[model samples]
Target: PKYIEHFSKFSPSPLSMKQFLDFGSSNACEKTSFTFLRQELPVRLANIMKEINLLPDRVLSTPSVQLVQSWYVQSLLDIMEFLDKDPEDHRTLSQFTDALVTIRNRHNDVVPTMAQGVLEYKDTYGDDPVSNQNIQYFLDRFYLSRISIRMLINQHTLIFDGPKHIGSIDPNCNVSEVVKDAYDMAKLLCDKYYMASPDLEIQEINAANSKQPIHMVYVPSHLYHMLFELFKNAMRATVESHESSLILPPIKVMVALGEEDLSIKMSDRGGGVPLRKIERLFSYMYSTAPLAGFGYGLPISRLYAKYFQGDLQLFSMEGFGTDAVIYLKALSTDSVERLPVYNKSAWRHYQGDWCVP
Candidate 1:
């Protein structure tokens, strides 16, 4: 009877003008307001807004709003680009899915924690504004993180149809072949967009830092693209600039093959990054030189390293150049131990295209 009555009276339809006006007002007032405002829409309206770019306009039309919205858009786009390049990029796709699931789970956990925190605070402090704001901030972060994850998942799904196509393609494609293709593709794109030199040397690792020797271990093929981007940035910094000398110092790379990991140390001769901005080097969109660096390469590269239970470290000399140390898990007889559970399920799902629910 309730279902019948609900279906009869609650004819779900697009938001009326009055609703939009009120929603816009609230969205202007608080950062989290847009989260609730979006919830009121039916699936139909949500799709229309997305298709027509109205939803982005809601938060991105203004210069200030665009700042935050652009970062979100760029993050999604970066994931999408990688997914599109090779659906069979199993490691990256698995990592992407895990990030989505992890963020969702974290958000679910945060919600009840905040709810309990708020009630306790209200009982003790008798409805304090500061306490309320603290709870609100927690809730806002939880909701935003969920939204970001969902955005990535939706884009990834649309691009790859889960993971089956990728799994199949990856098995047949050799790792070296895949890496070479990606490297060449990157170089072509760089030449078109960043004016990268065709003659630039793309090496694995050279012994440049014997004093602070580091190591890289893993599938050498997987780390190629990340290194390529770093080298491209250096080349652009040294060779492309009018003020900077075209005659550059030889870049050095140090490869340390660890027992369980692979580490790559790449050093460039270009002037180093400023000390003030060094700490922010790995942050996305915090680019000191936008043309040379999107500030995404380091963070995304580090993320890839972590996917293999590894990391990326950086050391820069003021007058010399920058050295990037990349670490990755080495393939061994115990490689099974390093395989993620999600990857197994994802591979199965990708192959069968079966819906879990």
Candidate 2:
């Protein structure tokens, strides 16, 4: 319960780190920004540490939660130590960006394990409403805090490494190109993991609008990440559902372009999830494949889509197939509002600062 209060106090600021970098490439400005971040980051890390320390010994004993917490704490400490060095050489910015990327990836790895912990806690203490509410509150704040940290790191990388970095998203990006790239990467992953590669068939709908070369103002990397995850799941499922000698059905991708929205749908002929277990498909700990300790692809992909005012939906019929739709709003603006942070005040209740009328 104390941990809930500790997390509720931390939230993403309305002002972005990129705003400071936009002040120009002057050393004075960059140095001042870096110094401010160096000071601010440690304070946030301390708050996180305080929360972790408040967790009960039984909760801390969970292997998945313990592993994630260890890596998270170490990563924060590493970043804090690195920031203390405070290199003045501009060339060192790239190195710092690399360090930030490492930390970001580590944080990404923690999500699924932490999610597993939440479920485990709920199962073990279903009768304790107070504890359950506190854990849920902690989970919500955890997502918001992680998003804030990732956004800050991304801004730092963009300031130092330019738009070529995968972290940087273009406002005016080619959806077709991004989908193709993600499909290619997904194919590679299927080959490496499943030892089977499935064919991908992409079709562009709205022939009248095809001449305009449908472009969307969105984050390319975010789109790519979602597409890649969806494609990977489809390819693996399709390839694994059939016999080794039988030719597997190709996965179908349909891209529909409209003035106000873009819809990308992917269909696979793999045996769909059972009706009883369908809800677990999006759970961070649920995975059909026994590849690793972490199963975060689908849940995290959905989070990315929702972060941009988009939605990811999956429909499946057992023994038939599955269709996944990713719906995104089309906008010309480059600005994205920070996600709201939420906390619980009572059992099964929550409040967010951005929940204004």
Q: For every model shown, what is its TM-score relative to the native structure?
A: 0.40, 0.67
What are the per-residue Cα lDDT tens digits for candidate 1 across 94-211? 5555544443343344323333444544554455544344333333332333333343233333333332222111212232333345446555655677564434333332235534
Model 1: which ten-residue window has the lowest total lDDT?
Answer: 334-343
Q: What's the lDDT for residue 303 in model 2?
A: 70
User: What does candidate 2's lDDT look like per residue over 1-357, in tens digits?
Assistant: 343344346643444323433533443455565665555554455455455545678787888777876776676666665554746876655566677778777766566577667678666754264664556445544554565566566656566454333235554577778888988877776778777777878887754575676676566777887888888777877877885547878888888877656889999988898777775656533432233331237766777676656688999999978999998876543234345433233223432568776
* lDDT score at residue 350, model 1, on the 0-100 scale: 24
Q: Which number leads on TM-score?
A: 2
RMSD of each: 19.7, 7.0
Error of 1 at 204 (Å): 6.2
